[PDB]
Write a protein that binds this ligand. Sequence first.
Ligand SMILES: [Mg+2]
Ligand SMILES: [Mg+2]
Ligand SMILES: [Mg+2]
Ligand SMILES: [Mg+2]
Ligand code: NA
Ligand code: NA
Ligand code: NA
Ligand code: NA
Ligand code: NA
Ligand code: NA
Ligand code: NA
Ligand code: NA
Lengths: 1011, 1011
Amino acid sequence: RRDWENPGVTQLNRLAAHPPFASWRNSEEARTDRPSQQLRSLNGEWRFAWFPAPEAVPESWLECDLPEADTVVVPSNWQMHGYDAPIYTNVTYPITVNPPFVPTENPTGCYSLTFNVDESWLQEGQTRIIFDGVNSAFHLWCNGRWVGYGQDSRLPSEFDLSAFLRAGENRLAVMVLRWSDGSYLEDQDMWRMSGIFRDVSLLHKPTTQISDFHVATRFNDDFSRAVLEAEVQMCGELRDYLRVTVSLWQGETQVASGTAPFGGEIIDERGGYADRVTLRLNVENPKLWSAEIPNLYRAVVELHTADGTLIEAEACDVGFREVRIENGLLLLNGKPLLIRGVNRHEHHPLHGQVMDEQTMVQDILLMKQNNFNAVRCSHYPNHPLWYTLCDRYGLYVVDEANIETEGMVPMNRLTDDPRWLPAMSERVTRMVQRDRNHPSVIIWSLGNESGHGANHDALYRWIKSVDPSRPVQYEGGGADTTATDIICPMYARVDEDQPFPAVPKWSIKKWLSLPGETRPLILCEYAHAMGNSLGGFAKYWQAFRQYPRLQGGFVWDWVDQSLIKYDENGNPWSAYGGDFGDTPNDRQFCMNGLVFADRTPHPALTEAKHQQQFFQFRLSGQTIEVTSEYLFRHSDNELLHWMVALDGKPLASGEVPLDVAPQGKQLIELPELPQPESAGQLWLTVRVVQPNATAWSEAGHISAWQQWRLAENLSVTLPAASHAIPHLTTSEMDFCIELGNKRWQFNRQSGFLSQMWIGDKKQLLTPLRDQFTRAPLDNDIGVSEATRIDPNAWVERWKAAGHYQAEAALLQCTADTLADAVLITTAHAWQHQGKTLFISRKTYRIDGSGQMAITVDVEVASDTPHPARIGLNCQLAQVAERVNWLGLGPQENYPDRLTAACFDRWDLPLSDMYTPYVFPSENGLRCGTRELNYGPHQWRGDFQFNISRYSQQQLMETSHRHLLHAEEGTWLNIDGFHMGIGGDDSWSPSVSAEFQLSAGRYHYQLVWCQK
Amino acid sequence: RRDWENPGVTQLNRLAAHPPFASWRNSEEARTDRPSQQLRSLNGEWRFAWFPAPEAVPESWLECDLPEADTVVVPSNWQMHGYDAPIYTNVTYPITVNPPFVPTENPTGCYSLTFNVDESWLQEGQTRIIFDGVNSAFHLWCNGRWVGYGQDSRLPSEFDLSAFLRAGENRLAVMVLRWSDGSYLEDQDMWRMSGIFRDVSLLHKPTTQISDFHVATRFNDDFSRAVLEAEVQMCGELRDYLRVTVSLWQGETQVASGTAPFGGEIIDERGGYADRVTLRLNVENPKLWSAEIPNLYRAVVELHTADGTLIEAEACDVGFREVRIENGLLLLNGKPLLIRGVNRHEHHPLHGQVMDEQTMVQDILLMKQNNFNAVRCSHYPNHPLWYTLCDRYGLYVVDEANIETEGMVPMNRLTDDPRWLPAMSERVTRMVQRDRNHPSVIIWSLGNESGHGANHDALYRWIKSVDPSRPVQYEGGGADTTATDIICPMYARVDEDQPFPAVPKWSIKKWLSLPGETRPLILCEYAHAMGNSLGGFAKYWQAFRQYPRLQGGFVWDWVDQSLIKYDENGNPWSAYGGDFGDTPNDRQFCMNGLVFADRTPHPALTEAKHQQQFFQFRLSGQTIEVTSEYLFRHSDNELLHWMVALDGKPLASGEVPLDVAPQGKQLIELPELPQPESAGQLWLTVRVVQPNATAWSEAGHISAWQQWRLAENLSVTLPAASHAIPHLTTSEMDFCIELGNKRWQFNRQSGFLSQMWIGDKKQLLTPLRDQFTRAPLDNDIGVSEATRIDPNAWVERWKAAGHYQAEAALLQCTADTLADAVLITTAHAWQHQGKTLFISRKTYRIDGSGQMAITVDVEVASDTPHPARIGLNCQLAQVAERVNWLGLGPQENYPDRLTAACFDRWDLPLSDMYTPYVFPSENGLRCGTRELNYGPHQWRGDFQFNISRYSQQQLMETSHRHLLHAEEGTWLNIDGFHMGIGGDDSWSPSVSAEFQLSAGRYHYQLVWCQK
Ligand SMILES: [Mg+2]
Ligand SMILES: [Mg+2]
Ligand SMILES: [Mg+2]
Ligand SMILES: [Mg+2]
Ligand code: NA
Ligand code: NA
Ligand code: NA
Ligand code: NA
Ligand code: NA
Ligand code: NA
Ligand code: NA
Ligand code: NA
């Protein structure tokens, strides 16, 4: 038969899809959502055996346990047990593209389970087994008898076992095929794994039972009244005495209830559905559901007899909310949304694709804490609990069909093919059928990167037709096809067009206004967060706020898909593509998240938090204007704290409770701000604090902040008559400067400050030298590969230009004595294959105070690519415990990614100054720094810096953070200017022009001194 | 695996659908559409054995012939060979409704063929088998090896036998299931048969080949320039040297040609289709296709190498025409269509569902000859040649998916069920893929009577997406759902609404203007031509012509679905529902056509012919205004013949050439018309004659006619005075009147004219009495049945009122004497259970001239159902050869069905005065009769009459025409008034009110005399 190589066969004997069931035989348990005795989990310990192909499976296995099998926990991915390697491939299918066939060599997992079944279950009713997720296809046998077959790794597959079970001990046999015709529709950019990775359970239902139920909530013009309409379908024998009661609960209070016998209205010439009924309940002043306030009711549906005897009850949470597109805007409860979203794959660094509640809750909490209000299920239906959580914690969800065929050529090879219409349609219809009652689901998605074919148009219409309550979106074929209600591109930039043929990515601002275009625009994917990224994130938010039809996006993406590996010592490390022997592979491309696989944040997450704030502020005078971006709630859990500080020193602060209506404003007058005695810049900072803990945050959570510079007083104060004069000692090879117990030495042939002593202690491990490059970020690299260079990537342009191989040539090195000081002058040219790339001119002034003033004037040839940076660097001899600076922080920040950072006095352990991206690179920079303190040293000026135990050299040479090792001393990189990091996408140059070091001539100055 | 009881499996190993291929290896042949050596017929003699269930078939059969098998012709329907009975059921499924299962006793036809295959076929390329039509499902084996499976009885199932054949003799084995899950989608109203009922063929294709091609023709604003676009797809090895050449020919002249290598434009991010290519050819001044003038070009598609070697050629007929709906109208080449359509099932009285080219041609010619320009493929895709003929002869076609699930409850039960989307999808997509290059197809239909389900919306969209060139219609769920571009009701009436719940049938005039409605309206079915029907046909035509958005309709239907049976003496007779022992069944409902199963016309065909005329005329004075309803051609094969006749006495005629541009007028002045010889009504008749023969008509064909009354000179002439005086003889029992050779005998107890003599010859077999009833037509009976009376049917109403059992009561009978005559006066009451239904009052005046003048005044109780007729009747003793009359004719005509008839003197064999409707009823009436002659008799007046060898009693007691027996003498029915026959539908009263005998009081006068 070979069912797994035939798209016309997606399953056999599989029962129809439906909303979550539990078959309660008690209404109150249904109501309270408590555990049902009729729903049993079969998770736990199973028997497993791996085969290289299904043909290698012994027939004996059907009847009894193979001795060689092992005992593993289910759910699980077999790759996570070490049976075979998971594979990380992004676009390229992991198998030869020759649809619908698969390799003969097809890893087959043989699972089995011995278990008991009570006769009461068998004596009456129906017993079905449910597989929440099986990757990628499987055959099912029960007690040596074949039951059925199923495809679609992301939706449950259920089979009736009533006639196969016996009272007592029973044996289940499951054969899971790693590859199948289903794989052709599962080309998502993630680890390719396999097995029974989601829940397995048994459900007992009565013969006469509820087989499906739909809940709808329609509203009046101002949402002050609603009608809850509940359509109920049954299976089993119909009887006049049967009844259906649907009741609606607001907590313990019974809001409404209606009852009726089966038998719907006349549908057509042949009549109506005798086996369905629709109950309609009026609700006055419903408490509306939103991500701001996730008000929910409980709908209980009871199938019972006229005498009042319950047969069974099913139920669901209900959120009263209306989703609609009108006049080009996506409205929720009549208000236009602003999606602060994120795409989130189901990934566990240890369990692979197996999802648990803990994990899910932790994700949600972090999301909420970080001002995210929506998530897109990239790119398949999620584990069922996920929707229950979003419902309850409150997140807007885009539910997406498990359809991705990006590896086809062209992209819509399958989707435009009618022979693939059925398989595809099952991926769409079964999703809708299972998830349609969830209020957190506000938009349906037809899948991802599958081109645009006629199958998508058909499915788009099917959906609109069965569930008019939610818009339908799809990005394939150019982001604005006839199969999408929303213009939902991936990586379209804010102002910059990327006119690819056939599927150009217009600037989002321009897209909205193309001739005849009227739909809302919400990026299904944007701001690719791979490595040190999210450069230019603010640019998106400023546009979203400015343009009404620009309604947000889903950042790509939530968490890094790194897996855990263990070294010889049994120490764990983060592995990516290729690390399991998987090949071909896509290396680090599986790590694009805002958090690390273990949920620790990347620094970009804080930039996201800030841009996504729900309160905007404006300062005028002593007047702060706060404006609420909430659409439904009042700021009833917020207070504004403010503080004024002069150069980090706090002068005043206070607090005012916030009282702002959704969309409203509040003016706050600050109190008389006494002057201040000392030159310096006064800075005002405000933060919004939630005095109370919520279901997703603790008392004291800071939900937003802002800063402004206030008065500044320039120091006009002339220093003081230096106690002594520095002495210059000139030799053939060095200019030596002595002052107190301090010495500086300048090598006359190199032209660099080669050594500095404090007492008889050398302070440097390497001379202080100009530096123009950085260990390349993911964004600098893009797709470039040693074996296949992308000459357009930044990294490649810099290498070729000789930037990383350039050699300093001394053009001049003089020393002069001034009245109270010693002055050294240097000039150096950096050349490559006869071309002058850069010229650096410096002055060093050492005065009687022992401060060393460095002035740097740099020239950059116009025709060379813009450099990654323009600074100096050195390896200090010293290693100190803390880093203290007065600048932007506390976390890592870059030119195009520094809005969330605040100007203050920060102090941290040196380790917090290094960001452990899995794929090492330039990291840990802090910009806008006026003062830096490390050990006895102090540097002052206006610069950006990074300090760590790793040289740029080591970083650029190391592929996994676990292989890095602390060098001797501390590497200090101090930049007059640094290039932005970009992140619009990570496969093409994405650093905005205003962030490129293209001025041609650069000036910076710094004072090094001892503290 | 029981594939036939799973809608999830509709085929196994079947090849993709595609336009007709022939794989010519010679271009000139492809060009002239000559036979191809690569396309061979397997039709002819096969081996066949019948089994009661698939489980009864022996395995031996796979390997060798069953000795018991018979040798039969293929294609055929096995029921047609007497192996089992064909079943005639209309809506109710012939099997228990329990999807997707079917009965265990499932008639199985085991067919086989041993045939030869030449090595040349096998040395290279691909050899596939093609089954054009297998009802309902089948498994296929070749040389004992299983090949695949197929469903959908109306489309070709193709399999690659390449790996299964050997040079020389080969053996196929086909197991055909009568019932399958596919049967659930095949509930059309027609006989339920089975077998390999369409051609079987074998096609050889090279390995590198043309796998599909779509032809599109697009035009400039005025249709003076077109672009022919041909998208070509290949399978097999791509090489740079491959090319596609597409050439377009008009007859023997090459219009254009173009070549390119494969490689289509970039479609998306992954690129384009390397295996496709689109050639675009400019056509200046194309000759446009239409049903008025079916100009065709030939497109030839060559696959070959750049060095010029041909690999293979395919081709098709191309008709340049655009179909579009705009501003509410369906336009063809920019002009609004007026559809003169008919529904046509594939039926042969002998061959059952096997269609041959002779039969098809015959159908087409008759249709064309009767002013039809369009056909609907009710309700499934037709035999391929049908389209080719429609292309070439010129008829607009509606191609419809083989989806009808009427017997479900409610009707959309399967169509709204996503589990059935797949099965449905293949029925729609495979049709389009096969029929999309035929110009004759102007509209696609999603099927028939399957309610309205979400599957419909999806498919509707799919088609819109894949072939934008033609509108999509579908009547289900109410005729105006979102799954149709055209309001296409079935049996909606002209002025009368039928406001059924959920799916009302509004008057079509009212339908167009419902709030918000703007679509065009074309009835998918109207004017149910069952038996003596088509009453009110002209009312649709008047509406069609007056209202622009009323674009016509498809009459139901073309031919009766009667089957031939043989009597004990081998004499053939027309059978219908229940005649094969089939039960349950729908009796005569399978006979609704304009023509008998043998193609002989029923009388209503002429009605349709006249109403559907392409020329409209008006008369003013001596001036005839001819208007053309052609949209495209000038009247270039037309001349007008006119004639003026006085009381059928010709006075003058002439002929004028017609020269009318489409939609234009022509004014023709008739010549001075001399004054006429005497009293009477002059009548003008004009006729459009085509002097030259056409592909579909003979020289001399009359395509249109019309009449007008001209001057009438009333007779003021007082006749010469009887040179005699009738003698009366009063007896207790009788009043006798004598005059020469004649004698009249009037029964004094009955009050009726009981006998008449001429010489010694008695004139009557039964007395002359009033008649108020008719042998009920199909429309009078509707769905009423003995076992399930339908009290609203006119027949029931009459029966229930006692109309058929009413007995005459003599109220009065007197003989009076005048100077010149004898006057007999009578009066009778017809009653039923004390109710006086009708009162008849008359006078008979016999005078010196031998004429018997009869005067009748009838009263009808206001509260009794309106009687079928009001007249007299008698069985004449004579049986004469001819029937001559001055009235409407010559064909049978009724009040609501007489517009096509013409007033003139007619003379037919008495046998032509009987209409052999298979289900016997009142028939043969001729209206507006002023004089009737038969045998020695003459009757004059103004009436309607019928004359035959069958009494009404007999017609009304006989079920099949073949059982009628001529009675002694000749039955005469002379009516003053007669009820219309109706026909809007045949299951509810459909006689319009102006055609009901509701006046309460009626008067009529007849003169009887000797010819
Ligand atoms: Mg399959
Ligand atoms: Mg992808
Ligand atoms: Mg099937
Ligand atoms: Mg029907
Ligand atoms: Na916006
Ligand atoms: Na990725
Ligand atoms: Na507050
Ligand atoms: Na690195
Ligand atoms: Na019209
Ligand atoms: Na019928
Ligand atoms: Na003419
Ligand atoms: Na009859």
